[PDB]
Each structure stands twice: as structure tokens, then as C-alpha cells.
Amino acid sequence: NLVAEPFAKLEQDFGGSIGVYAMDTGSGATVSYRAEERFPLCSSFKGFLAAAVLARSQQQAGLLDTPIRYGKNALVPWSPISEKYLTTGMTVAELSAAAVQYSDNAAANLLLKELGGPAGLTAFMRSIGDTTFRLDRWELELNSAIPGDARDTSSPRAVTESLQKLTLGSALAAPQRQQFVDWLKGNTTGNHRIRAAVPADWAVGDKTGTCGVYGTANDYAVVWPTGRAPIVLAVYTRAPNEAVYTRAPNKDDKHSEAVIAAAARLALEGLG
């Protein structure tokens, strides 16, 4: 009750719902708030998509350097890397880096197609023991974040547990885990979320998600303190339950950025 109060207060100030799960891999200590509830994945599925690619790389030689020669019909809004390389194509690894580090939408759809679609990615998550994750749609429709809709959702606890398995655990061999870690570490889209909570001399790898509803957003991360075991955590939000066309949205709350950072701080502080 007392441990949760700061999260409850943060949630009450936010007006929507917040979900947090954090685990310290050295002590086993955890912090949990609405950790079993479902939240829209949004773009955060792209990290698990890259992990699924890496799982296939344990069995198919040359997959990562295989070129995908896509056309303009594969492009989607906010596909800055795919657009830049439209005239040369991109390899599977380059598409994975683009999906993870720039949240490139076309790259995500191209990789989804290679892995059997949303059902294929979901089957991969089942294969690592994640019974909560479900992906049902493609970009951009998977971002709809319709309240009560279980499509394209998971829970903070399942996200954290799967992330730990794929970066630090046994769901992938070390060369694959290292590539996943390096992609996450180089993410460019998370500088206002979990990373805002982390001491500078630590390291972070993360993947953000931002849905088609203001206030529904998320981030998950592995955090490496100096001289201490890594921490794995996930912070998800659902927007409060008119639209303004004459101004750009607030940078601190449009994607729950301040709330996600604040929740991440409380999680790191609460571990013990």
C-alpha cells in the first residue's frame, strides 16, 4: 500500500492508468503497479520483432545480411530510414536496427511480413513462454489504442519478463542477445522516457511506444548500473478515459513522457 502510494498519486495527477514492473536481476527485488493489466503495445512491439529476427538467425545462416528490395508501396508515415534507402534496399539487420532505433514503420511491416505477420510474432512470444503478448494488426492500425480493446496489447510484467529472457537470459544465445542489446542501447527515440530517470554513468537500452491516442505511451528498458546487476523494467500508460486542432501538443504529456520518467524514477528508487 505505502510502496504503491507514490505511483497512485502520480497516476491520479496523470488522469489515466499507469502500469509498472521492474526487476533487479541481482537481488530479485521487484516493483509492481498494475503490472498484470493490459496496455497497448504501440511501437514497443518492434523490439520483440527484432528479437524474433534474431531467434531466426540462430537457424538460418545469412538472414541478417539478406537484402530486402522493397518499393514505395511498402512505405508508411514515419519511415525515415526506409525512405532514405528506398533506392538501394536494406538488409534484414538494417531494417531491424531501423525499427528499433528510429521506430521506422515501413521497416517494422517488412520484418513482420518476413516472420509470418502479427500471428507469427505472437507465436514467437509464446515460444519463449510469454502467454500475455498479442499482436494482431500491422502499422499503423495497431496503434489505435481503443479503450477495452485487447488487440495489440501486453502487460508490464510480461514485457519485462520477456525482455529479460531475450537480453540477459536463455531465450537467445549470447551473440544474438548482444545484437539485441546493442540495438536497444542505440535507440534514438527514448531520450525523454526511462533514460530521463537513469544516472548518467549507467547504460540503458530501451524501446519506446507511442499510440494514436495522446496519453497512451510506453517504454521498456534494460538498465546497467556500474558494478551492480542490471535492472529490467517496463512502464506503460493508457490515456485518461475535446481535441484541439489549433496548437501543437504538450511535449511533456502528449506521450506521457514526464509520467513515464517519473514512474521509472520511483521504480529505481523502490528497488531493495
Number of domains in the chain: 1
Q: Is 204 exposed, middle or buried (0-12, 13-18, 19+ CB in 10 A)?
A: buried
Which residues fall within 8 angstroms of residue 68, CB to CB, at 6 or more apart? Answer: 89, 90, 91, 92, 95, 110, 114
The closest alpha carbon to 97, from 65, 144, 62, 58, belongs to 65
Q: In the 8-state DSSP scheme, what is residue 255?
A: T
Query: 100-120 burial, b for 16+ CB within 10 Å, e for fewer?
Result: bbbbbbbbbbbbbebbebbee
Range of the domain at 96: 5-270
Determination technique used: X-ray
C-alpha grid cell, residue 158: 510480461
Alpha-carbon distance 127 to 187, whole Å? 26
Spell out the long-range contacts of 52-55 with Cβ–Cβ below 8 A and sequence spacing 24 or more: 52/115, 52/120, 52/121, 52/124, 52/125, 53/92, 53/93, 53/96, 53/111, 53/114, 53/115, 54/96, 54/166, 54/172, 54/176, 54/177, 54/179, 54/180, 55/124, 55/127, 55/171, 55/172, 55/176
Alpha-carbon distance 52 to 199, whole Å? 30
**How long is the chain?**
272
Query: What ranges in the chain are assigned the alpha helix state H?
Result: 5-14, 45-56, 80-84, 92-101, 105-114, 117-127, 156-167, 174-185, 257-270
Reduced to 3 DSSP states, what percent helix, strand and coil does the chain have, rounded to the nearest 5? 40, 15, 45
Note if the bond before 233 is cis, omega within 30 degrees: no
Alpha-carbon distance 216 to 236, whole Å? 8
Catalytic annotation, pick one of 17, 32, 43, 82: 43
Alpha-carbon distance 104 to 97, whole Å? 9
Output the domain CATH number for residue 177.
3.40.710.10
Is 43 an annotated catalytic residue? yes
Residue 29 has a CB neighbour count (10 Å cut-off) of 13
Q: Is 25 exposed, middle or buried (0-12, 13-18, 19+ CB in 10 A)?
A: middle
Catalytic annotation, pick one of 27, 36, 141, 269: 141
